[PDB]
């Protein structure tokens, strides 16, 4: 595999599960990991800790690519948002940019109905 110095970390942070995907700067995904994949289910995988460990796993996976610089793109609302980036930092990439990329419509599609609980 071709080594690459700089890339992006996409952090899809949902309410139920965090997904971290490291990619090159062009768009092509190198590796990924998830809180659900990291051995957490239901209550556990919707937590900051879980997200962090997913991030760590992802980092581990893209060791062979030899990535030093990293820009982070954080998507969605969740626990795995601050935690994940911290984890990434710990894992030892130079974090270059921290971007928020939550899809906010400018009033477009009707959301689903409100839950009655």
């Amino acid at each position: 595999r071709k080594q690459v110095s700089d890339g992006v970390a996409h952090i899809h942070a949902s309410f139920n599960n965090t997904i971290v995907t490291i990619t090159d700067r062009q768009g092509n995904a190198l590796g990924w990991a998830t809180a659900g994949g990291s051995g957490f289910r239901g209550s556990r995988k919707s937590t900051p800790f879980a997200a962090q460990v997913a991030a760590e796993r992802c980092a581990d996976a893209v060791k062979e690519y030899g990535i030093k610089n990293l820009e982070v793109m954080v998507k969605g609302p969740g626990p795995g948002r601050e935690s994940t980036i911290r984890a990434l930092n710990a894992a030892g990439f130079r974090i270059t940019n921290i971007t928020d990329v939550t899809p906010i419509p400018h009033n477009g599609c009707r959301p689903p109905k409100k839950r009655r609980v």
């Binding site: 609302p77 974090i95 971007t99 928020d100 939550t102 906010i104 959301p111």
Partner: protein
């Protein structure tokens, strides 16, 4: 909330800054709001109710303040 880490800037500081930016944006809040459909009526009601509450806080409480507690 696009941000770039400055030269010889700590990670933690950067993170904090990012968080602040996010807060300013009100992105999370927006997301929360758009999770489910709010009927127009409901939306109206909240807005008016909230306004009323605010008004109550401002004036009635001020009146109370004039008189000492003990």
């Amino acid at each position: 909330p696009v941000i770039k880490v400055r030269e010889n800037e700590p990670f933690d500081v950067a993170l904090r800054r990012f968080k602040r930016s996010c807060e300013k944006a009100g992105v999370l809040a927006e997301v929360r709001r758009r999770e489910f459909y709010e009927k127009p009526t409901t939306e109206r009601k909240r807005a008016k109710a909230s306004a009323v509450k605010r008004h109550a806080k401002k004036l009635a409480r001020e009146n109370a303040r004039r008189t000492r507690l003990y």
